[PDB]
């Protein structure tokens, strides 16, 4: 029931940030 990355659907927590997630799991 949490928000998830709208590209890959990995769940986000309070510590997630768009920048960190994009850097780790997506290509610039």
């Amino acid at each position, epitope marked *: 029931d949490v928000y998830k990355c709208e590209i890959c*659907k*990995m769940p986000f927590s309070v510590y997630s940030t768009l920048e960190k997630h994009m850097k780790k799991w997506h290509s610039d």
Partner: nanobody
Amino acid sequence: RVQLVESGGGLVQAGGSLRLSCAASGFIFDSYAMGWYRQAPGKEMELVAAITSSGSSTYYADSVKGRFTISRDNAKNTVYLQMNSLKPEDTAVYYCAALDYVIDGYWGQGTQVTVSS
């Protein structure tokens, strides 16, 4: 442009194992993080596991930690999901995909997994 051929699913008993494979082609495999997703009928799709382009980092849904292991072979363009200690809750069709393109809505056929109670 992209082609993903999944296999290795089947029917097992609670406690069994399966090894899923995905053979990938039509893109530069080593450039992208890959994920295994599962889709059960009537339920939300779940990202089960993911692995960065190099293999250096992995993500797992909490419910499969310690039971599932994701890996990749960039020489063979393949992604694997080793599923041990399977449970009925794991029953679903499993699909593999490059993370960047999950939103594009193009998927392989997936591979069915049923775990009898």
